[PDB]
Amino acid sequence: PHWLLGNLVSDFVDTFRPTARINSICGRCSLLPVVNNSGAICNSWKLDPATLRFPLKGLLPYDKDLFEPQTALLRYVLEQPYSRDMVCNMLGLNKQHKQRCPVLEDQLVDLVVYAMERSETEEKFDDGGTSQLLWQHLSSQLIFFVLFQFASFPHMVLSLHQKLAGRGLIKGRDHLMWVLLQFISGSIQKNALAD
């Protein structure tokens, strides 16, 4: 607040702490759905497409985690197979209109670097070992989200370049190149080469 009001306003908002405490589903950050492709989305899991925050009723002083971007929920849903329509129903994507949704793009990049880390752990003790399954699902999911311009290719690639830094992530770079080959081979003729 302003330095002249000060305590007079701040303590006032603190007395609205119990009301906000009434109107909070406890453990809402750690509750996760079971992804069904059926549609008819329950509106509990909808996030804000601008900032990945839960949409909150009122202007109360809610608990400090409810003002954070819910990346855990979105990463859990993107890691599941056939969670294509559910991510659109969460982030309000519509497919009649292309938008370049940025937080979706950053979450997809971080999903790629997480797959690269988990491929660089060993990937050789267990041949299947959930790694190549993850890379196949990443291929399919990322093809859809870059193809309809909900995310964009070159910003994704150069942000991916900025992440692959200081971890020396090199054991499964062939998989990452394969996924990029899926995008390029899918859409080289539609866009200019400078992309």
Partner: protein, 420 residues
């Protein structure tokens, strides 16, 4: 030459009991002066305010209350006119940008910090655009012949032809720091010593070269010690900045080998490259308590590279401020001839204020005085304009004055030449 206006503070002068501080001044490409002054009334933050003065405005002076805990050393506009870098003693480079595209609301979200070390030189990185003006083609009826781009390379190109924007600052220790602004809001910083022998850098300056190398000159003020030179190369290695320095040929200074009375002028007081992107010529200014000498040096090769002197003044008063021109003239021999014949003198002048009232506009190459303006108290900061027809200057009082310099320096021209 002439005085257009003199803008003074009202009743807010008479700084008492606290001594003066050096001032900064910066004229942008758009006509906005950013400058600091020693107001010193009921607070020392009145010496930490950055005044923005639109030069057509009668008296509307905006006053950014910068949160600089020590005194502001350097101010520096962008290559455009849209951002302003300000750095003080004890680190803390702040990058002010406009708020809601108003020239009256500035706010800095981005900055660097090398704590405790005073920033002594500060510069934006070069974006690779450089053009040259051919005065002998003034009638040539096509703008491609008059102004032509000169194939300059930007330091740190990133994935395309596009330069990164960022700054490089040089501290009073040997430290140099580069901060690179991403197209996103991210900023990468790196500091590294200039050479392994860490030593005092009391004066410093930054030029750029073709090839994307920064060339930073250091001096420790003693005027009998060498003015050392370093080549800095910036790179981005795996998402982080990386600085590679290399020693260049240093120079000593004449008036120390004079051997008649060499002990005079014991302080180098100004070190300036002749223009940023003109890294081969250097203007130095040795000074005693009363007198001074400016000198121009050049790197020219034959030891392959070796600093040789061009010219020097005879003896002056103590130089209080120095302003170098910004108009990028083409500087070769035919253009010197035609700019002497048709008396075009906008890009060939430096201004030298003195500790009496006088101001001398002096030649670039052989420092012979072209004009003299007697103030009728000294200019503590001067800055020429981007077309170099007017010079702004802050005095040893609250007074801020704008002088117009005629393009032929007072020699009368027929009307067709002045028109041209």
């Amino acid at each position: 030459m002439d005085l257009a206006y003199v803008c003074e503070w009202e009743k807010w002068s008479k700084s008492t009991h606290c001594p003066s501080v050096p001032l900064a001044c910066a004229w942008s490409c758009r006509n906005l002066i950013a400058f600091t002054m020693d107001l010193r009334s009921d607070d020392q933050d009145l010496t930490r305010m950055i005044h923005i003065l639109d030069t057509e405005h009668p008296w509307d002076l905006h006053s950014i209350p910068s949160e600089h805990h020590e005194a502001i050393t350097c101010l520096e506009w962008d290559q455009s006119g849209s951002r302003l870098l300000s750095a003080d003693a004890d680190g803390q480079i702040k990058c002010w940008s406009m708020a809601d595209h108003l020239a009256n609301s500035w706010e800095s979200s981005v900055g660097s910090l090398v704590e405790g070390d005073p920033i002594v030189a500060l510069s934006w990185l070069h974006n690779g655009v450089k053009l040259a003006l051919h005065v002998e083609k003034s009638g040539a009826s096509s703008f491609g012949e008059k102004f032509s781009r000169v194939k300059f390379s930007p330091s740190l190109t990133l994935f395309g032809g596009k330069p990164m924007e960022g700054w490089i600052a040089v501290t009073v220790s040997g430290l140099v720091t580069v901060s690179l602004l991403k197209p996103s809001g991210q900023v990468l910083t790196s500091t590294e010593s200039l050479c392994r022998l860490r030593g005092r850098v009391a004066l410093a300056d930054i030029a750029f070269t073709g090839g994307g190398n920064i060339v930073v000159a250091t001096a420790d003020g003693s005027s009998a010690s060498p003015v050392q030179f370093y080549k800095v190369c910036v790179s981005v290695v795996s998402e982080k900045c990386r600085i590679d320095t290399e020693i260049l040929p240093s120079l000593f200074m004449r008036c120390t080998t004079d051997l008649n009375r060499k002990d005079k002028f014991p302080a180098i007081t100004h070190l300036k490259f002749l223009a940023r992107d003109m890294s081969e010529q250097v203007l130095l200014c040795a000074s005693s308590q009363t007198s001074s000498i400016v000198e121009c040096w050049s790197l020219r090769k034959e030891t392959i590279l070796k600093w040789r002197i061009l010219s020097a003044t005879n003896d002056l008063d103590r130089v209080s401020a120095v302003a170098l021109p910004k108009l990028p003239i083409s500087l070769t021999n035919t253009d010197l001839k035609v700019a002497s014949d048709t008396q075009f003198y906008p890009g060939l002048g430096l201004a030298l204020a003195f500790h009496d009232g006088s101001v001398h506009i002096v030649h670039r190459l052989s420092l012979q005085t072209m004009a003299v303006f007697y103030s009728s108290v000294h200019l503590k900061a001067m800055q020429l304009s981007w077309t170099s027809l007017a010079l702004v200057g802050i005095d040893s009082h609250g007074k801020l004055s704008v002088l117009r310099l005629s393009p032929s320096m007072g020699h009368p021209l027929e009307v067709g030449l002045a028109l041209r």
